Amino acid sequence: GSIKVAVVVCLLRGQNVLLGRRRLGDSTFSLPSGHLEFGESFEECAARELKEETDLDIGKIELLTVTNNLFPSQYVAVFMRAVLADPRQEPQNIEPEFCDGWGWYEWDNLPKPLFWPLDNVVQDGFNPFP
């Protein structure tokens, strides 16, 4: 019965956020997320997750919020927003075992179904854009 910390990233470019289709939460749309690794800052975790999942290099990583998500496991999800270090770059599906693909979505028109921990914060008015 373990408590785990995930870092979830709202990678923003213009009016769009990056979402991928997951392969917990199979085939729902979700933000880049992953487990905080010991020694990591939230920002380092966010950057590593994006690099590992999409090969994207992100920057201006900023804390947004944190949520509590119960499953034998409980995830404290730390939400960060970021931008691309080079906005000309596009995500590459580097981990097809965990993701079917990446896309840019407008916050006003998110895809469905969202991974339920993400729907939960969207339901609460979560908005990563400044």
Curated annotation (Swiss-Prot):
Tissue: Expressed in petals. Little or no expression in stamens, sepals or young leaves.
Binding site for Mg(2+): 49, 53
Gene3D superfamilies with a match to the protein in the record: Nucleoside Triphosphate Pyrophosphohydrolase
SUPFAM superfamilies: Nudix (SSF55811)
Reaction catalysed by this enzyme: (2E)-geranyl diphosphate + H2O = (2E)-geranyl phosphate + phosphate + H(+)
GO molecular function terms listed in the Swiss-Prot or TrEMBL record: 8-oxo-7,8-dihydrodeoxyguanosine triphosphate pyrophosphatase activity; metal ion binding
Keyword Cytoplasm listed: yes
Domain of life, per lineage: Eukaryota
Compartmental location: Cytoplasm
Chain location of the short sequence motif Nudix box per the record: 34-55
Cited function: Involved in a cytosolic pathway for the biosynthesis of free monoterpene alcohols that contribute to fragrance. Lacks terpene synthase activity, but has a diphosphohydrolase activity with geranyl diphosphate and farnesyl diphosphate as substrates. No activity with 8-oxo-dGTP and dGTP and unable to dephosphorylate geranyl phosphate to geraniol.
Protein's name in the database: Geranyl diphosphate phosphohydrolase
Organism name: Rosa hybrid cultivar
Gene behind the chain: NUDIX1
